[PDB]
Write a structure and sequence with these properties.
The structure is cut from a larger assembly and holds one copy of chain A (about 1150 residues), one copy of chain B (about 80 residues) and five copies of chain C.
Chain A: E1 5-6, E2 16-18, H1 33-43, H2 46-54, H3 63-71, E3 74-75, E4 81-90, H4 97-102, E5 108-119, E6 124-126, E7 129-136, E8 144-146, E9 149-153, E10 155-159, E11 162-169, E12 176-183, E13 190-194, E14 200-204, E15 210-211, H5 212-218, H6 223-229, H7 235-241, H8 247-258, H9 268-278, H10 288-297, H11 313-327, E16 332-333, E17 341-342, E18 354-357, H12 359-384, H13 392-395, H14 399-411, E19 415-417, H15 423-430, E20 432-434, H16 448-451, E21 475-477, E22 483-484, E23 490-498, E24 501-510, H17 511-514, E25 519-520, E26 536-540, E27 546-550, E28 556-558, H18 580-590, E29 604-605, H19 608-615, E30 620-621, E31 626-631, E32 635-639, E33 645-649, E34 654-655, E35 661-662, E36 665-666, E37 673-674, E38 679-682, E39 686-687, E40 690-691, E41 694-701, E42 713-716, H20 718-721, E43 727-740, E44 743-744, E45 773-774, E46 779-781, E47 784-786, H21 794-803, E48 810-812, E49 815-816, E50 823-832, E51 843-855, E52 862-864, E53 870-877, E54 893-895, H22 899-902, H23 907-920, E55 922-923, E56 943-944, E57 950-951, ...
Helix pairs in contact in A: 1-12, 3-12, 5-8, 8-9, 12-14
Chain B: H1 16-23, H2 31-35, H3 38-48, H4 56-60, H5 65-80
Chain C: H1 2-13, E1 24-27, E2 35-37, E3 43-45
Antiparallel strand pairs in C: 2-3
Classes of the chains: A alpha+beta (about 1150), B mainly alpha (about 80), C alpha+beta (about 50).
The complex binds magnesium ion and zinc ion (2 copies).
One zinc ion binds next to loops of chain F.
The structure holds three DNA and RNA strands.
Family (chain F): Belongs to the RNA polymerase beta' chain family.
Protein name (chain F): DNA-directed RNA polymerase subunit beta'
Function (chain F): DNA-dependent RNA polymerase catalyzes the transcription of DNA into RNA using the four ribonucleoside triphosphates as substrates.
Chain lengths: ~1150, ~80, ~50, ~150, ~200, ~100, ~280
Amino acid sequence: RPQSSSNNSVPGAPNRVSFAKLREPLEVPGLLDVQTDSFEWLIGSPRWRESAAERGDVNPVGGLEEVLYELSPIEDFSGSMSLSFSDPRFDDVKAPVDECKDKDMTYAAPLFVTAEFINNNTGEIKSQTVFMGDFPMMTEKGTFIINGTERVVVSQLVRSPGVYFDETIDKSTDKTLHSVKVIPSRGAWLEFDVDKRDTVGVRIDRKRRQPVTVLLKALGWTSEQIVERFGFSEIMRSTLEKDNTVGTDEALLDIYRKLRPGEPPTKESAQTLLENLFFKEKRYDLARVGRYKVNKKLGLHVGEPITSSTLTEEDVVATIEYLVRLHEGQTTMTVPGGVEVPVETDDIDHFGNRRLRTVGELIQNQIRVGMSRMERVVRERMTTQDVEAITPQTLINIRPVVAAIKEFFGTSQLSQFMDQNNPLSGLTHKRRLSALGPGGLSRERAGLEVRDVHPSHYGRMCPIETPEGPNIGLIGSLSVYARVNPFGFIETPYRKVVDGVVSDEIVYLTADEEDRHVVAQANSPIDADGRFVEPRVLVRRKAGEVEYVPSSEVDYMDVSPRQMVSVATAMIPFLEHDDANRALMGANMQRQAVPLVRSEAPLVGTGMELRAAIDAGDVVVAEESGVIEEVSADYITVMHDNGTRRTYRMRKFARSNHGTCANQCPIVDAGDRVEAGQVIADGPCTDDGEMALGKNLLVAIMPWEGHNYEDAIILSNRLVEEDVLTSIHIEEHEIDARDTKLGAEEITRDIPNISDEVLADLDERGIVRIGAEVRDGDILVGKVTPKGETELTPEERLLRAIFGEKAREVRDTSLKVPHGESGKVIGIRVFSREDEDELPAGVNELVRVYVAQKRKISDGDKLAGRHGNKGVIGKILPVEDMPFLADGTPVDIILNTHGVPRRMNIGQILETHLGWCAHSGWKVDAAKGVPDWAARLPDELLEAQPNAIVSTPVFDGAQEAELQGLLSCTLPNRDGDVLVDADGKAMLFDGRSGEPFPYPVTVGYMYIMKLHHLVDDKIHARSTGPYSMITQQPLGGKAQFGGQRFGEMECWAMQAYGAAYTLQELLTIKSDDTVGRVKVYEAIVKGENIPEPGIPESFKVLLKELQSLCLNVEVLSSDGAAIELREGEDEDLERAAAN
Amino acid sequence: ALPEDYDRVPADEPNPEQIYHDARLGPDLQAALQALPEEFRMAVYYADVEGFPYKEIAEIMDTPIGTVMSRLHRGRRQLRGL
Amino acid sequence: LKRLKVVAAFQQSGNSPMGMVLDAVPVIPPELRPMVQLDGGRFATSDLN
Amino acid sequence: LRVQGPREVQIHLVREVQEVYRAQGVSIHDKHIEVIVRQMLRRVTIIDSGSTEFLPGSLIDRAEFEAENRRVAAGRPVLMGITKASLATDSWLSAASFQETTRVLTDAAINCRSDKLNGLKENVIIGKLIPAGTGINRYRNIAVQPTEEARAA
Amino acid sequence: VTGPGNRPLKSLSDLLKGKQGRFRQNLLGKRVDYSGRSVIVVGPQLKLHQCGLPKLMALELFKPFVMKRLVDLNHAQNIKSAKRMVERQRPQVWDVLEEVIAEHPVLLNRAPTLHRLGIQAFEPMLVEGKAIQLHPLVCEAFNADFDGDQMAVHLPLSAEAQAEARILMLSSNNILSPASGRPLAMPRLDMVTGL
Amino acid sequence: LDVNFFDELRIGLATAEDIRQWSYGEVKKPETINYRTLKPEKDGLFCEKIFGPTRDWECYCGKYKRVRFKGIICERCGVEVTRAKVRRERMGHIEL
Amino acid sequence: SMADVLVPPRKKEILDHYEERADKVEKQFQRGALNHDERNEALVEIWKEATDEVGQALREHYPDDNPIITIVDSGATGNFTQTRTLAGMKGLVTNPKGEFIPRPVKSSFREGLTVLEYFINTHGARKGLADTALRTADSGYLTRRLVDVSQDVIVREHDCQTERGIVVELAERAPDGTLIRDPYIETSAYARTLGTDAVDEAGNVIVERGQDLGDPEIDALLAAGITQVKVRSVLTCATSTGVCATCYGRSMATGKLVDIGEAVGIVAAQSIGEPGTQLT
RNA sequence: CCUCGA
DNA sequence: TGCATCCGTGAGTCGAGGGT
DNA sequence: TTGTGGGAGCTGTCACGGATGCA
Ligand SMILES: [Mg+2]
Ligand SMILES: [Zn+2]
Ligand SMILES: [Zn+2]
């Protein structure tokens, strides 16, 4: 296939002809590697060993080997006995992924280690294999299965360990004060600061500021050695002149008085605490990342030894001298060894000081916690028992490690319910970059400076794809070609340049390294040999600024124009013609499209569809070349060349986390020979291997009788009749028969006061039958509950007493269909204690019913293109009402004109024009030579057959001249008529009156998505229902059949209207007047007048809470006495007895 | 702990509509009203709904156990029809 | 003046300042500090409990 | 306020706020701003208490200051912030629901305050017809009866 | 004092403070009954005083009224039978529904309610579908568009509340901005372009 | 029973005599309920004796479960046979 | 359509001329005679001028029946700044700090921004979305404070009959015979009740006190040659607790005199808070 | 609490 | 005993779903 | 109830006013 075909490397990929004019010198890497490489490092897999040997460090150390080397050996007080851990090993997995999702389990494998015990007393070695627990495993898709649900561990953005300087300008004295922060990987922080009074102060974790000289005197330094190293700023001298401690002994005494206050200080507690606080690797550690940072910034030990990673006296001296020189205008420095260290303040938002904690490190930290607690238990058990009896098995208590892993995966903000609307949503979810969490910043500290685009984000974190709401700037997504460092930094690849010749040597750079060299753009002319063509090229400099520099001075070049964007963003055709807000909205709404029953790849793409679908995992890919041996809707089995067979089963009508349908379909036939890497089956939102999130709709840009007014959208009824926008939604309902005080619940077909008709669709167990169409309120699972002899209704007591029935008085608690739900029962799963099925305490039976519904497109459903053009369907017109082209073809979707120009997303128009060309094909007239506008075109684009799929990459797509040229040579319809002129418009007829519309209208083909905001999920209402217990106000949310909130601003609006009675009614007899609401129901049922409002129960609750706060609050009548607000309930008895 | 909002902890009481239809009686309310004599109607309604002692229903109508216990045994067989 | 604010507030009203020290603490009724049984042997309470 | 007087600081505040709103193309009528400005200058500071129970340096409503004076005393006009004026309201229940609930409740207990329960916010809280619009006694208590010429027809 | 997960325990004073406290969350504003919510769509065929109520939403909102009128007419034997019929969505209710809807106003609200025009009274007409139909002239007051917006419906019950809806809060009675006196129920972009 | 026409709402400091007059009993145990029977422990934070019965007209020891006994106090358990509604208006106290 | 978005045919030459001027400023900076702040300020001047010039060429090249022109100039929707961003040039883009950048976005959205232009424009876009998030909450807090401080102000009587008020400028006497109308009349004098009589020099009273002062009354006062007028406001209302209807004046919503029960305090708080989201 | 919608 | 500091306020509304 | 054994985890927020606490 030619070079203009995008994704030529992938075998069997569709031939998408691309307008691109620049060669791709580097392929998109594995988009899930941010997860898999991290987890494989944590494990110590062979896939990780090969990479660590090839291009990593010369010494490979795994994520668990690291924790074990940090933990072993465990010794006692006398050092008499030692226990070491080695060789982390994994057995096979306990259950397959589907079995784990089914049984509400956790996909995990058992962990084993070699625990060697040596005894210095009796001279013996006692090795043993110890079981460490069930470690949760990462699936092929990069996810985890926890308690039956699929989860993603989002990488966290955190401050890299190191030394960071910040200057703060003050109004008082106008002086610029300076402060230092030392952020380690473990242990508590220390801080330096020059005060308003020119007094340099050192702070410990949470302690009052102490003079910096006290720290030197806490390390035993002499009063003259301080004057030899400092005083050139004289600030250190004037700090020593300030009245402070006398000698080093009283210094340690007063500093041990600071730590642990209120305790009687001593002379040995200081020697014991200061040693372990910042200089013992057991309680303080800044990892190789932090050691590298502090050594590179301060020039310490540039000879590259990384033996020790702990704050040393050299580091503290260098840091205090750094602060002293930074307070003055000193911009250069040297240390006893420090070679050319600049003196600056540090940018906290820069991606050279801001690192990533991937899933591997996030799990490693929790493992470290569990291991330290286990070590405490081990040391506490070593002393108590005798050498004759102890063993590696008896000392070890695995419970804290298991508890830590469980608690992490079950309560961490970084372990998130996977977004599974469509493959793209999950794909970007695994590449998300979250700023909040444990160790990161708080939501209440997320200032504006954290959230905006930083210049160091270029090629690492996309600037477009980010939440539109309160999480804006806090959740990014990794760029396409970006990659995470072993240190935790984000690197991006650049082509190397030597003497104005751009080579094919690729080098991955960190933001630190990038700020040193000169990086050009991808849109830069290049000779056939690789040499620059311009005298000077556009380049990006250190501060993030840009300039023009001669070609003899450029070092690196962008590998791709797409380098700075994420996957979802790179899927927007004509992105460069869209404003950033609408582009962000399009990127977000691509992750909200639902899968349709039939996929259809877009006529106009960017080339990212193929790779996105493949790397998303929801597509089936051949692991090895071969020939299909058998193909069924159930599975596809391929016979390899060596004789081995591989079979792939098909997820068929599977529910996602968000109720969308995951349904895979084979796209090969019985004889086909497939290559390794070729797509064998199409999952959801995929068509022939490409991400197909929407449909190609015939669109006319024009107002239409105000039905598309204000972003509303009009649709041809053909989209319903032909199910082109129909989607499948599956909902899981569940109920459990459990134990109660008065007896045991039971799942039965026999429910009291129920006709045989409304139980027809139930089996003998009391469960609905597979294939039944259930309506609003139908019974899914029958279930009775034992009832007490005081709960019986008057009509119930009569039937119990007249017949003298059995003592098992049961209330109907059957599982019924919620409002707004309907569909066919497509599956039932049942668990019983009669079998070995595990259930929680006191639960006899547990049954799940799966209901599927086919939703056609409707009024209120939300559609959106890829350029932020969203809107709800205001009107579905009959096919005869739509404006139709000259040949009778009715348009499918009418988009209002007034939206396009002011939202600043004109790409949606360009996409439309190209969308028409691809629909009809073209034939560029080359008889008298190739025209001038078509010069830059690759030869494969000079003619196209109807319905030609076409790729327009972002920042390298079809130019305006070429697009204008294509509209001229549009091939005609079957009758030889050209329906769309060279302006992109056409003469439409009004299918209602019949007369043609007076002016030509832009028609074309636009990619429209069905967003997961469907009116079936939004519509809700309630007259009366369940109430809150604590406040007696209606519950909230649709799922609980709750009422709507009438908030404080609504009451302000009421008062501004002066609608006093409405306001009283809303706040008394609709919320918490416990008698008023029942009297209202009675009055409405009997046509009587609505009664008088009572007293809001929430006011009584407020009074009771104030009285619980020792506040004697009393309600006083007009004369001064206290009004008792209580109830007597004879009235109900009077009415019920007179009944 | 509870969820972060305590107002989403549901009360487990019947709704105003639920307590209206549960306090009334079905269509048989005209069977025990007209088809039974007022001797059976008044004695059966106050021995089963109220659950009074056998001697407390003896006091309301000025009748011994021989009358109250009989009108109950016969009113049930009366209401067994229909 | 600041001190006289509170001193005269305690004086003019007949509210004894002894109320600022407690010998018994009130306990809010249980329904306003709910304890609910969760799925299984688990339970859930408000922080007040 | 001190130099030029209250009816001058009112003009000053209204014109400044209107300048800020007009610099951005906002057309708000002056009466809306005046309704807000009025609620700042409603109180006075007690310089010399004299024969009165008011503590000196306290902020008392000008109505109470002008009516409490039964000769049978020294008050200076005060400009007040909207938060300050709101927290110093007639109704402790009203202030407890606006800001600083703890401080308001403590100072209300100490001063043994009594809320007269007159004000739309308090009626909202207790479930009473607010004293505005259709809730005032003029409209809320109306006698309606058909005429005799209509009772005949 | 922290519980599990280093989370501070809500004290007695926390119950009153903040937007989540009793004052802001349970006294100055509450959740109400006889209320619903749905996505809005533009209905140009509507009159300024009208709005399109989805049929299911109106049925649930007016449930006791429908039951009473269903027992008045002999469609229902007793009130429990009427309740069962309304729950099963029997074909007889709809003729009754439009009967009890006539001239019974509803209140439409779109948050954020910035001014009093953020809540307006409308006469409901039954509409096929699940979306509220909103008059295109009230979008300036609600700041409403159709990019996915939703609105809430409240049903006044008392005679005084219905009167306040029909007189004070009626849509066609509030055409001018209460802030500047300028018209808000004014022809907007498309209608402008047309005229 | 009472339309909300109150003249004033007064607040002040609560003396310990007020806290004792309000209270219906003294809480003395940390135990909340019996995990087995889901029955409140006596003198605990949910004690039915002082706060109120969990179920309508039912005492703790089961001697009275009927509306006929309305008003009496069960001499075995000290629980008043009345509505569970009172369980949201009966305050306890703790003697320090 | 892509055809309706006309590119100004003089854009290249305009940008070349202003690039010459920016190059002169850059050579003045390379000489050492210009300050860095002066360099940035001069470049901002240059590129603001160039943006205005390409906008002028755009509006001169566009026929008045063009749909992008018809939509804006009819008052339907949008503003010409958006038209200039689409067809002309984006212009200057802000910093994450709020400053402007020496090099502007010379491309239009019809031509398609370059990689660096798009990346620079994202800064302004993101900062604008975040700051709007902030301003919404600030305006909400101010509105709540206003609502609370003002919910005592309700109308309670028809007329306190006070003779106090405020004088308001209705016009200004220019040196010519023309009378410069005051801009604040829509918000200062309109919809007020008249305090004292407005009489002309040697003439009858043109508007009696207590009049609504609508457009007819304002125009009559102006044609009469009156330049100041005293009106009754709630600043000078003598009512004890609330305000009187006559001192308040016309109800903006109903167009007539404000009714009795109206809680004009909440209406005022909402009228002040609602457009708060637009301030910068 | 989190993620999302206006 | 006169301030500088520290501590304690406040920071939009309404929705959906999923968890401890 | 004997022979040893001291913690997590945070700051990346901003503007304002007035009681507190020390020079
Ligand atoms: Mg909207
Ligand atoms: Zn008992
Ligand atoms: Zn007045």
